[PDB]
Amino acid sequence: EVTTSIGKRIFDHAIRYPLLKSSDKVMLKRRILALRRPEGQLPPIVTHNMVDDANDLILNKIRQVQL
Amino acid sequence: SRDLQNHLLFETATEVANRVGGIYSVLKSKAPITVAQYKDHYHLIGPLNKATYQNEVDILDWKKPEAFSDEMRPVQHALQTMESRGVHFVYGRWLIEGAPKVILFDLDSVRGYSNEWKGDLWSLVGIPSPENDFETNDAILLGYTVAWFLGEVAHLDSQHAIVAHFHEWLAGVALPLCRKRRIDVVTIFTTHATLLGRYLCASGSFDFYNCLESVDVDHEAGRFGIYHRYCIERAAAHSADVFTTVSQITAFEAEHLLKRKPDGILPNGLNVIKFQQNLHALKKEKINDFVRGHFHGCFDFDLDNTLYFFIAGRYEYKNKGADMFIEALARLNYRLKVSGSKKTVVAFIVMPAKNNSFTVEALKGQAEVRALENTVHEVTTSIGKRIFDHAIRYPLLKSSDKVMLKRRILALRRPEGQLPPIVTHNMVDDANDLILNKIRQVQLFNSPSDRVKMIFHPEFLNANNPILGLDYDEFVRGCHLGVFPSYYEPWGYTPAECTVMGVPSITTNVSGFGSYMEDLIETNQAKDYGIYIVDRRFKAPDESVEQLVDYMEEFVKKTRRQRINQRNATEALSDLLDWKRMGLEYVKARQLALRRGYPDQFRELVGEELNDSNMDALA
Amino acid sequence: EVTTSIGKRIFDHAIRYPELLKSSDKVMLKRRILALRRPEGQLPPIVTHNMVDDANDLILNKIRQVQL
Amino acid sequence: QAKDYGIYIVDRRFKAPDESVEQLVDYMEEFVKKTRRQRINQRNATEALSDLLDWKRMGLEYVKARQLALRRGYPDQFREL
Numbered sequence A: 001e002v003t004t005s006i007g008k009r010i011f012d013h014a015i016r017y018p019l020l021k022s023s024d025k026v027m028l029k030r031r032i033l034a035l036r037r038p039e040g041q042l043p044p045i046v047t048h049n050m051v052d053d054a055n056d057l058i059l060n061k062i063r064q065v066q067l
Numbered sequence B: 001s002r003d004l005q006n007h008l009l010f011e012t013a014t015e016v017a018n019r020v021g022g023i024y025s026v027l028k029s030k031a032p033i034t035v036a037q038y039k040d041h042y043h044l045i046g047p048l049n050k051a052t053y054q055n056e057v058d059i060l061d062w063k064k065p066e067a068f069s070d071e072m073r074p075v076q077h078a079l080q081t082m083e084s085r086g087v088h089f090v091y092g093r094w095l096i097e098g099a100p101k102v103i104l105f106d107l108d109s110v111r112g113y114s115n116e117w118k119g120d121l122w123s124l125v126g127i128p129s130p131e132n133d134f135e136t137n138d139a140i141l142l143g144y145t146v147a148w149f150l151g152e153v154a155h156l157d158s159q160h161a162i163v164a165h166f167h168e169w170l171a172g173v174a175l176p177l178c179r180k181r182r183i184d185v186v187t188i189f190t191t192h193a194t195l196l197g198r199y200l201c202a203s204g205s206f207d208f209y210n211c212l213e214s215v216d217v218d219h220e221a222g223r224f225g226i227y228h229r230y231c232i233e234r235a236a237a238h239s240a241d242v243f244t245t246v247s248q249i250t251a252f253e254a255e256h257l258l259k260r261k262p263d264g265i266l267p268n269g270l271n272v273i274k275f276q277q278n279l280h281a282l283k284k285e286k287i288n289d290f291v292r293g294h295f296h297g298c299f300d301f302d303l304d305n306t307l308y309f310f311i312a313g314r315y316e317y318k319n320k321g322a323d324m325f326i327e328a329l330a331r332l333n334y335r336l337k338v339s340g341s342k343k344t345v346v347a348f349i350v351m352p353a354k355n356n357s358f359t360v361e362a363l364k365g366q367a368e369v370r371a372l373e374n375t376v377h378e379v380t381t382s383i384g385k386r387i388f389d390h391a392i393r394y395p396l397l398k399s400s401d402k403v404m405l406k407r408r409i410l411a412l413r414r415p416e417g418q419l420p421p422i423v424t425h426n427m428v429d430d431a432n433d434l435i436l437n438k439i440r441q442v443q444l445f446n447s448p449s450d451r452v453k454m455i456f457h458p459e460f461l462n463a464n465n466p467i468l469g470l471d472y473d474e475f476v477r478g479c480h481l482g483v484f485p486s487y488y489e490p491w492g493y494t495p496a497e498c499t500v501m502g503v504p505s506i507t508t509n510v511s512g513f514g515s516y517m518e519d520l521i522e523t524n525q526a527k528d529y530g531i532y533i534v535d536r537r538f539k540a541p542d543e544s545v546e547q548l549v550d551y552m553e554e555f556v557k558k559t560r561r562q563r564i565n566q567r568n569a570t571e572a573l574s575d576l577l578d579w580k581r582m583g584l585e586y587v588k589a590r591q592l593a594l595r596r597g598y599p600d601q602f603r604e605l606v607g608e609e610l611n612d613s614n615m616d617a618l619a
Numbered sequence C: 001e002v003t004t005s006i007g008k009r010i011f012d013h014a015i016r017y018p019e020l021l022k023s024s025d026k027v028m029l030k031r032r033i034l035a036l037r038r039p040e041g042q043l044p045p046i047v048t049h050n051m052v053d054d055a056n057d058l059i060l061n062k063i064r065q066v067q068l
Numbered sequence D: 001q002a003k004d005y006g007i008y009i010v011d012r013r014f015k016a017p018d019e020s021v022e023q024l025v026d027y028m029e030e031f032v033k034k035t036r037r038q039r040i041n042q043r044n045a046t047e048a049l050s051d052l053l054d055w056k057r058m059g060l061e062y063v064k065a066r067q068l069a070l071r072r073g074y075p076d077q078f079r080e081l
């Protein structure tokens, strides 16, 4: 959204002769905050909730080899 | 010599920088209009929600001298004081369209004073209330802190006069305080619904809008446990110079239930340009796609000649009037059989419920169709090449193709006298859920004799729904008619945003929105502007129901070109609803406060004496 | 346009259970083919353009002189 | 009603050569001065007038011309029918 806005502003200037608005910064800065990692929290090794997590063979191996 | 012209604003409620209700929106959508008027002299104030606040707020260091101008220095110093005394607060911009500056009061950093304060309060009124009220404690801690902040601002500032606006009882403690301390600020109070009003239509039943002149003064607040709270609300309403509500209908409760005719009305705007290729024709097709795989196996009708009706939002079964909708609907089916009509209505219900995600039965549908689609598409671009090639050389269905088509069709069969469902989900409490129960009773089971089909999707829509692949704003543009026949609805953003999206909607004169709209359009031109207002105040409940059914029949029985000219008029109405116009009504109320508080300073400014007894009166 | 009808037609049949080239289409196709016939034993050209000195232009005379 | 449904009929039979020109300039000037709403409506009125230009209605005159021609060639023959 922010970039096709830049697009129009740029192209328009060019077409009349002879970039980031505030509104934009406000929303980008929000999208970034939205993305923060909950403090020493690590990228998961599963993508699902495991019915029998503590026993599942694969997670157990991954845990042991410490990745 | 406090300045009336170049003056300052402080807006407070509990929903600043943290969603809790709909006020978070109102204040938010309002932002950029109000920030344009005031720039750095506008400040939202509210209690800090230590969880959400960091995603919501750009945290700022107010201590730097650049953090306020020389003119606004006083607030800096009010804050200096405010930290000195061990109150802590977050200062910064709210991260929303408008970037309005905000003050967030750590209520923990003052729970110390709690006892002296919870004390000073009923001893400024009556008798205290159980510690079983995390709500009012916060309400109070907040009020006292805010009052305290205003005192200091009025103490240190003398350039500008200060308007302090307050939304809803929870942020209304600060108000008695300001009268009873007689501090040099002018106060406005907006209720977004009465507290007494919510409880009375809770379970039941009192011809609410009818027998409320005739309602027990206090005892009624007493029996509901709401008594200490009513008193804050009542206390709040009376202390402010200006008393307001959001809709004409809400000012009828306000007057009788809190005993003060509101000096006006602040109806909720939207920023229209946040809503405004043919969209309708295109989103309709994404709906179509779900209707196809939902009615798979038994598809007896023309989607070319099918109308989409929807009701949507928080699952208030009777206030939202979902009762009348499912009812008006069964009746509409009746009428439509008799007149042997060829049209078909699929009605949607988008109210969230306790669920276990999508019925297997439903995911097979939107799988097998996505499947048939691919095959049909594969078979046809094959035909394409074979045809074009023949043509290009001068001077259709292969076997391989038939084999696979015939499979896709078998895949789609209906499990023998099995009927298209009325839900799309597995319902946690199916046999009790109010909506299914109604649909069952009026016997709409999507029988192929039925001209009205019912579908209930007990989840807010999200775009990557595997079944109904739309954002709700897409789903709306997609439909034909929105039906929101409410009982209790102080404003009701749904019908509003629905209208703004250029979709015709049925509303009711007991709906905040509906009331405002009735009192806007000249009665008859309503229907043709694509707003149907259904009277649910002066008619017999059964009379109303029959009026909703009338409006429905009218809509069905309409030529494509008619429908269009209506839609067009509802787009044209969208401009009436933008903040730019509803925002003047806030300026009317503040200017009231600025007068009533500084009358001679006022009469000196305008050069003459104007009427103060009511908002519009003064303009 | 012809084939995406054929699509719609097949897909509608299928979802509706229990020469698909409708002769409106059959016509417009019969037409766009005729539009392609090469005017009596004339050959696909060896230039795309209305050359000026058509006759004395070197690249051409050599194509003709090798009868391509 | 012509103006609303999209047809400006400039008078060029009666009026001057020149007084027609000022009437063309009128209709144009009139049209420019519409806001972008008034316009979208006008276009909606126009498209609606399409239904009166269809052969599916206009043809009925060709249907008459043919009938009259029969009547006329076989007058009493026709009278029976």
Ligand SMILES: O=c1ccn([C@@H]2O[C@H](COP(=O)(O)OP(=O)(O)O)[C@@H](O)[C@H]2O)c(=O)[nH]1
Binding pocket: B022, B312, B313, B314, B350, B459, B460, B461, B462, B472, B491, B492, B493, B494, B495, B497
């Ligand atoms: O799939 C949906 C359905 C509804 N809504 C929103 O739910 C909110 C509730 O509407 P309203 O403010 O009128 O309150 P309600 O009528 O739900 O009590 C509205 O803003 C809708 O835009 C949504 O975001 N997604």
